Ligand binder design. Sequence first.
Ligand SMILES: NC(=O)c1ccc[n+]([C@@H]2O[C@H](COP(=O)([O-])OP(=O)(O)OC[C@H]3O[C@@H](n4cnc5c(N)ncnc54)[C@H](OP(=O)(O)O)[C@@H]3O)[C@@H](O)[C@H]2O)c1
Ligand SMILES: O=C(O)c1cccc(S(=O)(=O)N2CCc3ccccc3C2)c1
Length: 315
Amino acid sequence: QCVKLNDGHFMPVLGFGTYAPPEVPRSKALEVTKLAIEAGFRHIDSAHLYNNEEQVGLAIRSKIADGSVKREDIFYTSKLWSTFHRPELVRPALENSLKKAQLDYVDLYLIHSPMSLKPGEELSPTDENGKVIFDIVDLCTTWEAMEKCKDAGLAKSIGVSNFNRRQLEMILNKPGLKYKPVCNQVECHPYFNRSKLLDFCKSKDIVLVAYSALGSQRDKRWVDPNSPVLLEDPVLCALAKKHKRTPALIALRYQLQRGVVVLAKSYNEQRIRQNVQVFEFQLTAEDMKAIDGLDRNLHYFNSDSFASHPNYPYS
Ligand SMILES: NC(=O)c1ccc[n+]([C@@H]2O[C@H](COP(=O)([O-])OP(=O)(O)OC[C@H]3O[C@@H](n4cnc5c(N)ncnc54)[C@H](OP(=O)(O)O)[C@@H]3O)[C@@H](O)[C@H]2O)c1
Ligand SMILES: O=C(O)c1cccc(S(=O)(=O)N2CCc3ccccc3C2)c1
């Protein structure tokens, strides 16, 4: 249950989302990541940003040590945080991610966001007032440093996240390009289905990986809590009842049937296990059309600061 990437590697089509907000104790990532592997997840999505690479890495190691899986059966992703875009910072950031997870390699390393931030030790540098401080970096040079990380074998594959079509074209048309990104990891669910970007990615043999495929964690730091709750949608709920499944499973199956690799975050043992049931049923062509019709140009992620970033991907 994987897709072949444009570099010859293979990515499992269902991935586990490991992000939890800062209020969650760190020991939780370790617990739930083991649970996810135990349920059947083989793709595990982490990032510098998430401040959990130690614990995710330890969960991976634990399931290798206990005999359940081999290193090569797990697809582990991490990501370069936006304070580390300047090229000289990229390999050391990857090496630090590796040290924390205690892995020799990541299966995938992504540029987390095109919205470069001021370098330093803070995740979210802010000035005098409360304002997040931006940087300016030619992301083509960040990409070249990513290429070097694949060539050294530290990342098997390299890709990007939160890129729009123009930003993907920039890399695709870089003079001297060595490796195309294998994927673009983006917000994608039935209220923001990205069909036009999906078609573009497919035209270039770039996989679209969906985040917030279940409608996001709706944390009020990023998401308006009066936005509509994806999983309460009436159409997804009628489909769930028809198939004897749940709205979440309908949302995840949708993505698989359109050629999207889909992530699913849950820190609940029963929901983690429910989500692997996505492989157990199929939606009809008419089911897919109905879900297609939910699209409403809604990105849950919203930030007045980021909206002013020159590399803001939403316009
Ligand atoms: N590249 C980026 O910028 C970026 C952005 C966002 C996300 N991501 C990645 O994508 C992963 C997932 O996206 P996300 O964090 O926004 O969460 P999500 O997958 O959209 O999940 C949203 C909420 O759905 C709930 N849930 C999960 N399975 C369910 C089910 N079977 N039935 C009812 N509810 C269910 C979870 O709550 P519970 O824990 O209570 O189950 C979760 O908090 C992240 O963890 C991260 O790895 C990347
Ligand atoms: O990787 C994630 O799980 C995640 C969680 C919280 C924030 C971010 S972020 O700061 O990288 N960023 C995602 C892209 C985006 C787009 C529009 C508005 C806000 C954000 C936040 C990413």
